[PDB]
Symmetry: C2
Subunit: 550 residues, 2 copies
């Protein structure tokens, strides 16, 4: 692509501190840390790495933990987010500045590549061709979980066979749970193998007071918001369509909320608020039908609706239903064996309580099947496949009935022509914005400096992300501080706690202040394509979420 | 909206050098005279007063205008939106202001219907200013009201006079422009000086010929689709696990699918026109896709990307045949009647299809079905058997997409921005020369705007006579993919390489700031043709 050729030339921007000679970068030690919850149980699990302090960088003469060339292994883990390839080019450049004989190995297909020792050397020309591109496709990714002594030995072995000083893991809450646990295992067995994590995810559910945002979120919400903008403007143009847009975002509504603040849709559902008010499915339907009715009465027979794809895990009744289908499947593992959807399910309907079966058979037939598969297709970390559940079609179907029932009684004169959308996969491997491009490159560059100071069990961290990159602050966040205890697949396991929308936070407060105006009026915003050439103001733009929060 | 819109509202669309001249220094070049594509005789008699008009073209030179008084122009946005419509309107506005600052522009609301109800707004400079370079038809909205009853043409004429209009500009696809051609004559037929000009609009690009090189919006919509498809390709390479099936808008032709394929290099792209021409079966198409999926699995590649045009099934002769017989007899058991009495030949075909398609074909009777979810279904079946017979060891995890509505009202690219502004500006100059029944035309669209050629293509040359329900009606033949054309031939030469290898291209977002070579880029289709 001609675009591709030019964008490959962009020089990502570092924090001023990371431009210094590496033995002129010294550490500032902050407060020791606690886990978020289950501190007691996490301290006894993380014997060697619990309670590590926040690390900041500042200028000063400081001696490094290596004199000779580094060997670094690196993994792309989980679903892709725009910018991963810049984390890698940042890492590559940093180790080369340290010692030109340093070598970077990329393991293939996620953490599984590490367990099976399936790698490639990441060389200067290879890394050149990926600079500033989207995708994880330089080595590919995967969702393999590392949780057993067997996994840990193979990792140790494979790290030792490749003469690695450190492993950098780029991923979300799941991948960095691997990272924290793996660092503990190494330090526990006196292994001199360092483990650094990098905060990747479009969901933006990996963050805290120190990690201001995960990478990729900026790029993905910009792409989603333009498309949603375009649907709003097409709805205004024809005055006839109701668009229902499902967005990726399994466990949290950061993506939906950002897109709402960008576009001003007539309806955006926030899963977290749904849960807090213990809303039911039909209550949500009533609140959307209501908006649809008042708009039809203003002559507006059209609108745009956003719905987070993980909404079904925040409706307590539907959450219950899925957890029961789970349990019903965990034990009857045998009957299910070689049966089909049609019959896999007769058993389910049969093994459900009258209460849940009543909830279940209340759902449209196609939704019933989909929920089945969502439970079958859990990932290694025990995530339900929700992307796969057509929640926005569940809404459409249930709304149509409700509107028919009201046309029946002459209480709805209107014209309801729904259209469904799901924006998700087309945002994960897009070209990263300038923001994610600088942020990812800095993350990877920063990780090597943490490594050169002998740190392990840290998340690469870059603060003040709302300022010009030059003024960014660099350092490290201990992984254990983001963690709690959580029942996965039946067991109570130590994991990184996903960060959901703060219902007390400014992004949400701000949505709440306006969402009523946006419902009955047409105050759509129309964001454009991401730009990579032109005014810094346009090119280096950031998310509304990040402006409101910092 | 954005520092983006406000930065984008300031952009100055580029005109052809000829349209920058004083209007008195633009003179006409009369080309060869026209005849319809077919039914030449019937159309000559139908379009009595306007048939056989010659190709027009502009060049520099002292002339004489048909007006000195301020113009009153009505304008209509018709049919589905395409990026750039608002620039056709801004171009029109600016042109008539240059001619005479007292000229007024009236936009009728919601399509041809706003004309029939005198439902209109003056488009003043301040208002037009906020729509410059934006997507959408939303400055006045559009609609699909046909103008066909004598009562209609009569009220349309009424209302044009009610507002003192010298001309009406209609912006739309093939139907709308057939409409304008007829409307143009009805006005002439009755001794009224009201000119009607048409503007070639559609993302389908099924409105074009040897003189109309492309309809506006196609450029913008394909660039957006192509990025998203490129992004799916790159996600697919990244995780090595999904088969993405992308349906694109366009019930009638495959210009959009073909363009996106030349831009992304997907593993499969079905061209409806090619399927019709080779007279393929449904199952043959399935085999072709299965065969690709199998071979890539054998290479370790359990992932890929498929592009399919939205109108594909309607180009499968079998299927067409079946909706013929289904309409010939003419739920669960009431279809089974369709079975014993169906011809066999369609029977074996009717039963190839999944029940929800079968039951669906019955729902089509009252009158949709997914080109997308039919294929994925039928592929899953043939793979299930093949794994059961130890012939397929791969994992097939399909994901479906439909990119369409999110492309129609996006910001227009520079190309559509210049092209649409030029189209509207040009329409006024056709009007100032007293022409009517023309389509506004801009040639050489692959060169820089300044070297574009401006002129008019007579609407009747685009026509044949269609007949439905008793009446012989004039219609503009939809232009489909030329299987002898360069865009299609380029695809045929390379699609086999794209299937089994991973040669995905990754186009980026449309850019509006930066090097002319990126910002003023055009479609592959237009490069190959031009």
């Amino acid at each position: 692509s001609l675009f591709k050729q030019e964008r490959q030339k962009y020089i990502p921007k570092l924090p001023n501190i990371l431009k210094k000679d590496f033995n002129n970068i010294s550490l500032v030690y902050g407060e020791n840390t606690e886990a978020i919850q289950d501190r007691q149980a996490l301290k006894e699990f993380f014997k060697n790495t619990y309670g590590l302090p926040i690390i900041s960088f500042t200028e000063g003469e400081s001696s490094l933990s290596f004199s000779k060339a580094l060997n670094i292994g690196i993994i792309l883990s989980g679903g892709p987010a725009p910018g991963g390839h810049n984390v890698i080019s940042g890492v590559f450049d940093a180790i080369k500045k340290f010692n030109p004989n340093s070598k970077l190995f990329g393991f293939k297909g996620g953490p599984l590549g590490l367990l099976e020792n399936d790698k490639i050397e990441l060389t200067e020309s290879l890394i050149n061709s990926y600079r500033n591109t989207g995708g994880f496709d330089i080595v590919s990714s995967g969702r393999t979980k590392i949780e057993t002594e067997e996994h840990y030995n193979k990792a140790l072995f494979v790290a030792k066979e490749n003469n690695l000083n450190a492993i950098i893991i780029i991923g979300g809450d799941d991948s960095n749970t691997n990272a924290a646990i793996l660092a503990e295992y190494f330090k526990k067995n006196g292994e001199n193998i360092q483990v650094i994590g990098v905060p990747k995810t479009i969901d933006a559910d990996l963050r805290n007071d120190h990690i201001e945002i995960s990478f990729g979120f900026d790029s993905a919400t910009k792409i989603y918001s333009e498309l949603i903008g375009n649907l709003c403007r097409d709805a205004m143009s024809t005055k006839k369509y109701w668009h229902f847009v499902k967005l990726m975002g399994r466990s949290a509504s950061h993506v939906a909320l950002e897109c709402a603040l960008k576009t001003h849709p007539n309806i955006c559902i926030v899963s977290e608020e749904v849960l807090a008010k213990k809303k039911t499915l039909s209550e949500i339907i009533d609140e959307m039908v209501s908006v649809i009715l008042k708009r039809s009465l203003n002559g507006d027979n059209f609108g745009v609706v956003i719905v987070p794809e993980g909404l079904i895990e925040f409706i307590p009744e539907v959450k219950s239903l899925m957890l029961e289908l789970c349990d019903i499947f965990d034990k009857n593992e045998g009957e299910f064996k070689g049966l089909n959807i049609e019959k896999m399910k007769e058993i389910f309907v049969a093994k459900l309580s009258d209460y849940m079966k009543g909830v279940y058979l209340s759902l449209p037939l196609f939704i019933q099947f989909e929920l089945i598969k969502s439970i079958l297709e859990r990932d290694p970390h025990g995530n339900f496949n929700v992307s796969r559940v057509p929640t926005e079609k569940l809404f459409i179907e249930m709304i149509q009935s409700r509107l028919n029932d009201m046309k029946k009684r002459g209480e709805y004169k209107g014209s309801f022509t729904p259209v469904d959308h799901f924006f998700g996969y087309e945002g994960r491997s897009a070209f990263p914005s300038n923001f994610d491009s600088d942020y990812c490159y800095s993350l990877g560059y920063n990780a090597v400096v943490l490594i050169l100071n002998g740190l392990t069990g840290y998340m690469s961290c870059i603060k003040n992300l709302n300022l010009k990159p030059t003024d960014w602050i660099a350092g490290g966040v201990p992984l254990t501080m983001l963690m709690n205890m959580e029942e996965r697949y039946g067991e109570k396991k130590p994991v990184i706690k996903k960060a959901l929308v703060d219902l007390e936070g400014r992004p949400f407060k701000e949505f709440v202040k306006n969402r009523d105006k946006w419902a009955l009026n047409n105050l759509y915003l129309y964001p454009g394509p991401v730009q990579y050439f032109g005014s810094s103001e346009i090119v280096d733009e950031i998310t509304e979420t990040l402006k409101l929060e910092l």
